[PDB]
Amino acid sequence: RFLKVKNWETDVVLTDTLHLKSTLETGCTEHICMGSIMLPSVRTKDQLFPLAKEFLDQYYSSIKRFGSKAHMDRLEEVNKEIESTSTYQLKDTELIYGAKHAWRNASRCVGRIQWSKLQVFDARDCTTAHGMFNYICNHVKYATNKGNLRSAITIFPQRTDGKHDFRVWNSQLIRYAGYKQPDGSTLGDPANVQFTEICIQQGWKAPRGRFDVLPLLLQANGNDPELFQIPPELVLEVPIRHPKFDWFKDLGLKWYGLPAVSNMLLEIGGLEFSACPFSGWYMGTEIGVRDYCDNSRYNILEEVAKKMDLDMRKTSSLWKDQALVEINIAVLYSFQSDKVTIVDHHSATESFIKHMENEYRCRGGCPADWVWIVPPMSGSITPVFHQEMLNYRLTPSFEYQPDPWNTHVW
Amino acid sequence: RFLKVKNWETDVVLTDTLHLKSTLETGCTEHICMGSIMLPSQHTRVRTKDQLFPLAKEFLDQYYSSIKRFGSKAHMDRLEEVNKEIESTSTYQLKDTELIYGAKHAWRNASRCVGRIQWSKLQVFDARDCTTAHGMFNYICNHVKYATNKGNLRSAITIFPQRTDGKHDFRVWNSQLIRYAGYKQPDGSTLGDPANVQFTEICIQQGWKAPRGRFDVLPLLLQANGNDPELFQIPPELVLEVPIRHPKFDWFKDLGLKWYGLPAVSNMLLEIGGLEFSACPFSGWYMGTEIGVRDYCDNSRYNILEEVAKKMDLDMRKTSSLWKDQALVEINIAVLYSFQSDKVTIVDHHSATESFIKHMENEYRCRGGCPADWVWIVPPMSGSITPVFHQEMLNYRLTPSFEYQPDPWNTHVWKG
Ligand code: HEM
Ligand code: HEM
Ligand SMILES: Cc1cc(CCc2cc(CCN(C)C)cc(F)c2F)nc(N)n1
Ligand SMILES: Cc1cc(CCc2cc(CCN(C)C)cc(F)c2F)nc(N)n1
Ligand SMILES: C[C@H](O)[C@H](O)[C@H]1CNc2nc(N)[nH]c(=O)c2N1
Ligand SMILES: C[C@H](O)[C@H](O)[C@H]1CNc2nc(N)[nH]c(=O)c2N1
Ligand SMILES: [Zn+2]
Secondary structure (H helix, E strand, O other), X not given: OOEEEEEOOOOOEEEEOHHHHOOOOOOOOOOOEOOOOOOOOOOOHHHHHHHHHHHHHHHHHHOOOOOOHHHHHHHHHHHHHHHHHOOOOOOHHXXXXXXXXXXXXXXXXXXXXXXXXXXXXXXXXXXXXXXXXXXXXXXXXXXXXXXXXXXXXXEOOOOOOOOOOOEEOOOEOOOEOEEEOOOOOEEEOHHHHHHHXXXXXXXXXXXXXXXXXXXXXXXXXXXXXXXXXOOHHHOOEEEOOOOOOHHHHHHOOEEEOOOEEOOOEEEEOOEEEOOOOEEOOOEHHHHHXXXXXXXXXXXXXHHHHHHOOOOOOOHHXXXXXXXHHHHHHHHHHHHHHOXXXXXXXXXXXXXXXXXXXXXXXXXXXXXXXXXXXOOOXXXXXXXXXXXXXXXXXXXXXXXXXXXXXXXOOO | OOEEEEEOOOOOEEEEOHHHHOOOOOOOOOOOEOOOOOOOHHHEOOOOHHHHHHHHHHHHHHHHHHOOOOOOHHXXXXXXXXXXXXXXXXXXXXXXXXXXXXXXXXXXXXXXOOOHHHOOOOEEEEOOOOOOHHHHHHHHHHHHHHHHHHHOOXXXXXXXXXXXXXXXXXXXXXXXXXXXXXXXXXXXXXXEOHHHHHHHHHHHHOOOOOOOOOOOEOOEEEEOOOOOOEEEOOOHHHOOEEEOOOOOOHHHHHHOOEEEOOOEEOOOEEEEOOEEEOOOOEEOOEEHHHHHHHHHHOOOOOOOHHHHHXXXXXXXOOHHHOHHHHHHHHHHHXXXXXXXXXXXXXXXXXXXXXXXXXXXXXXXXXXXXXXXXXXXXXXXXXXXXXXXXXXOOOEOOOOOEEEEOOOHHHOOOOOO
């Protein structure tokens, strides 16, 4: 019950004890593994205090003041505040710690070696969509940093009764619109067809291009959401060209520099932050493999192979694989040439292996979701393919939450 | 209680009731997922008459259900006959019909196998009358001949006598019937297949005269009735090999690469109705990535990415040039081209995974589910451009089944 994990390429063996601190549940049982399910299926005053005590217990341990002076004081203080108000407010130091460790604990995240460098922006004093917009613009400008990207999170006021939730209705702060055509096919990003519909169904006048940055749809204190246009000078974009094939720039492709997830929920000490946009920088395959080549997305593999004059009549010519590689060489070359931070899947997975070693050494483990850590191309020539990983849920954490337009009383 | 899985690229949803018929444990709990452990405690494997009859009874209920005779007089008479055989002899014997059903359904239940659409067209060779290593050699030669079929490969399995007290096991000591030797040089480098250095040494110590080349078919090391194992050389005219060339790169033949055509796993344990068949070599035909991605490009195997990238002259200084990815695609194009050119059966990973989705959906329709191990079903290159990447999958353990077992040289009691 002190588990071991082995790397089959190097025979490195790590022992995991961290998992015994795990609290929440995975969805698996002894009779069935759900490890490939995408998304496995307010607080009463009672269950809130054990949540706060457990979080405070680990916070004060991390500063080497467990069972100390201030620890028992803070424990009493939070105890008192809950019985009366049926919630409590985090100190700044605890908010920063809680956010860094939600990332540290994100078992699907390969870029976690950077976890302790996160820049945490407290936006708990915000009251309106306009203020939200202002916090978000400042986040975007800070994180972009003229292409020298910096990790950042901005944390909006916590849930109170579920009627006054702060929510960013976009799934990412920067995404391209998607339009359905009269002739069935889809122009732009197919993932965002419904969201693009809501924005137009809200007032947005769409340019109807293939790369239209979506407006922000911001909801403060449970009110109706409001549209906002992110100033273009804050949306850093990269035109995609290839280091060998000059015809590549003619394809008219680009992508944005800043990946900023905005629809997740951040859980710290039992408190729920339903608007907490966070951003880092891209691994190349996220754009080149998934965004560009998923059949349900931009699905560009047909055009690239054609302009490569590859025999596309048999799958066994591996023309898709061959095209896929070139696209991803192009994304990397484009960002690197424009001095925008990006990491290739070989470097990021190699760093994650080093990060696992560190976590096993200094923390006793590292929860990790193999199905999501292995890149979606060239899996077995990356070190994470040959790495056994234990997956388990730790708190603080990021969780999924319902889309607001299915829930909001409009 | 029902369970659903979703294909996120097509939004197709399927409903699994078959997992209820599952007994054996997975390794996971409510608080930890062992989904990526290579050899979990439960996927690996003597039984007393205590627990044996319930396993027989459950197999026989399955068997007679499948032939629409559940509860029939033939069904009840067989249960009775098996019970009395177990109490008086402590084991039992499967009928030929039950052996065939058992082996097919062990393949059907193999949740890590992407090739299962073919499961009902398996040729089963009954070798339970075999008694000596020489007899095993003769059975395996005939399997290899039948399965190879001059390049028109045919799925086959050969089943040697079942375990009795664990002291009289039949075992094929090789991990596959056909594999290339690997030699450790004094300078630390490896000649041949590094995956086989340990087994190669065992063969040499047993008397094999190794040619010490880069592609030497290993001898068979066969164990009958718990006796010491013996070496046999498969007749070379039965080992179909394919020289590897590339359809555009004429310098690729000069790498001197070749592979064998018949993939034939020989170290698994087959479990049917509580009976353990410790020697049961089985064979199919290759998916190209098994050779092109893993055999040739795993850093711990032949590891040819360097030499291929050199002769392609790629930027090998920075990894962000994706020279490794570029070389890997070419090597896998060359493997598929060489096999198709020589009319030796092979399937590419796009075709195989598409077939498996069709197989899987059909299994949900007519069977109520299909256990599948996503970590193993998704191919080791170009994962997300194959449809299984986007397919939710439920993994659970059904019997009959194939199981791992310890390598015999770690458990064998040597006669001398
Ligand atoms: C700094 C560079 C980063 C890289 C290269 C990176 C990379 C990735 C990748 C490839 C995934 C897989 C999900 C997908 O393919 O869509 C992922 C998941 C995730 N990332 Fe990271 N990420 C980075 C930064 C961050 C930061 C700053 C945070 C939070 C502060 C974060 C939180 C998460 C979470 C919560 C998930 C998974 C959500 C789930 O459970 O499904 N990441 N990341
Ligand atoms: C017909 C062509 C076949 C193909 C293309 C195929 C393909 C595969 C592949 C790619 C794997 C993943 C294992 C690895 O990558 O090393 C696998 C696993 C497996 N295959 Fe198939 N297979 C075929 C036929 C068979 C047959 C005939 C059997 C037995 C009757 C079989 C039984 C299994 C089993 C038990 C596993 C699981 C191995 C484990 O648990 O580690 N396969 N197969
Ligand atoms: C900050 C950051 C995040 C990511 C991963 C993108 C990401 C994507 C999803 C949606 C998954 N799918 C259902 C669409 C959920 C997430 F929490 C998530 F973080 N990458 C990079 N480079 N930086
Ligand atoms: C008949 C057949 C089998 C296979 C899969 C190869 C295979 C590999 C392993 C070892 C797993 N790993 C630790 C190396 C165990 C197996 F049972 C197994 F069947 N493929 C093809 N084409 N045909
Ligand atoms: C079906 C499967 O769970 C789903 O496709 C997952 C698999 N692994 C993934 N891995 C990453 N990094 N991102 C993803 O979106 C997914 N999707
Ligand atoms: C650690 C990890 O579970 C292990 O490397 C697995 C991953 N998936 C695999 N999938 C296949 N088809 N074959 C393998 O050998 C492996 N190895
Ligand atoms: Zn699991």
